């Protein structure tokens, strides 16, 4: 009688992929890990606090209004379906508002009812303490994995509203890479330099397909399932060193990862894959502005009159911090060049994590 929230999951994931595209574009060929689901989870929560042109810009970017019937229920069910079978993966969302602000009568009751979460109230005029509170919330709600948020340096005595999203991922594989097969090998960076990096190897039947962009750039695509069938990592790797990674990045979508999943066939392959541990903290302001959400960051343009009548109120700071770890726990795919990965929840198509590994 109920089907997975794949509609919402796709809508949320595609918005998050577009945010990633903005982050990846502006990055100077450097490592970037990110959570499309996470930035969407947070912005959707923010939708409940905004009104007017601020809300307009957000729903127009995301492609849905949280006002509509069951969008929240879907999202809450989505989250808990996501975290159901899960120290392998931990995530947190948090909105911190100035304690002094008069909040609109029925907001918190509504916000908790929808999302089973609370808007945190802290005094930013006590700068050190507000910084402490946020960093503590993040560290403790990611099982210690995300300990600091350097972006909280931009907090000061005029900060009134701050949003935060943090995720850690370190998943065990369904088929482990043998410890013995781990070896050092040159990895060819995009700027032409090589580094010796440790690399895992495994011969096995992997879900695979070739993918070539409309302009002709050619990629190997491989599915690595996690020890729970629930999640999969997709590796998209340039067929040869010379093929640039950004051609694929600038046309990714959630729909597209699903098509790959649809085409893939299980074929015998030697996979050689670098061990890596990547951490990224993104200031989400510029990325979100590039997608049309400008009023939320501006003191007297922003409309937060579903959270408070008092102004000036705008988003002083919006940060995502993501840490991902990947280790062992006839035809060859040797990933000794930059590549893109995507961690996907298969029952909904939710793109949990996405990144470019420019240097392991």
């Amino acid at each position: 009688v109920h089907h997975p929230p794949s509609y919402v999951a796709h809508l949320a994931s595609d918005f998050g992929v577009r945010v990633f595209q903005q982050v990846a574009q502006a990055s100077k060929d450097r490592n970037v890990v990110f959570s499309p689901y996470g930035v969407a989870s947070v912005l959707a929560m923010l939708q409940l606090t905004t009104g007017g042109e601020t809300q307009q810009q957000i729903q127009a970017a995301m492609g849905f209004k949280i006002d509509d019937k069951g969008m929240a229920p879907a999202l809450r069910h989505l989250y808990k379906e996501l975290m159901g079978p899960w120290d392998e993966i931990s995530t947190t969302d948090a909105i911190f508002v100035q304690r002094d602000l008069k909040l609109v009568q029925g907001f918190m009751p509504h916000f908790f009812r929808l999302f089973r979460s609370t808007v945190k109230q802290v005094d930013f005029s006590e700068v050190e303490r507000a910084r402490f509170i946020i960093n503590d919330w993040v560290k403790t709600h990611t099982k210690g994995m995300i300990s600091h948020l350097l972006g909280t340096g931009a907090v000061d005595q005029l900060t009134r509203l701050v949003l935060v999203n943090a995720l850690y991922f370190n998943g065990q594989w369904k088929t482990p890479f043998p410890d013995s097969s781990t070896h050092r090998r040159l990895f060819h960076k995009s700027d032409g330099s090589t580094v010796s990096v440790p690399m895992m190897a495994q011969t096995n039947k992997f879900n695979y397909t070739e993918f070539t962009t409309p302009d002709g750039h050619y990629y190997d695509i491989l599915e690595l399932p996690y020890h729970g069938d629930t999640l999969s990592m997709f590796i998209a790797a340039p067929y040869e060193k010379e093929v640039p990674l950004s051609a694929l990045t600038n046309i990714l979508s959630a729909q597209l990862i699903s098509h790959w999943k649809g085409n893939m066939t299980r074929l015998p392959r030697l996979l050689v894959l670098p061990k890596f541990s990547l951490e990224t903290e993104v200031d989400l302001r510029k990325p979100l502005e590039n997608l049309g959400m400008t009023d939320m960051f501006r003191p007297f343009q922003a409309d937060f009159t579903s959270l408070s009548d008092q102004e000036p109120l705008h988003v002083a700071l919006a940060l995502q911090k993501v840490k991902i770890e990947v280790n062992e726990s006839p035809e060859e795919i040797i990933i000794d060049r930059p590549f893109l990965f995507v961690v996907r929840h298969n029952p909904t198509g939710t793109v949990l994590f996405m990144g470019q590994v420019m240097e392991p």
Epitope: T209, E210, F211, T212, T213, P214, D215, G216, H217, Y218, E242, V243, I251, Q255, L256, H259, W260, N263
Partner: nanobody, 115 residues
Amino acid sequence: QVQLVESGGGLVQPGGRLRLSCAASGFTFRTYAMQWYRQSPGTERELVAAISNIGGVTDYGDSVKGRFTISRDNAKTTVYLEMNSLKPEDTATYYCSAVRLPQRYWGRGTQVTVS
């Protein structure tokens, strides 16, 4: 061995439609992006439409978006270009290209005339 043969071009009244096709052979079609270009005397060759190997990711030149649709079938090793609401401006030789960098192949062209 490698062959790209376009067909379907001809004369059509303004506001009309045409479907071009391009039969291909001798390479791994299903791993190539397929593209349509157009060219007349005096005016530079230009991209008309492009399509990924799978997933139907498409790209269109600005002149033709919302009128022309590219599609493909990998089992038939054929690519198509439906043209609608044709205009005199669309008069040109349309050429099919397959591309999997650094490899690119070209067809022989088919004439489309709208007057």
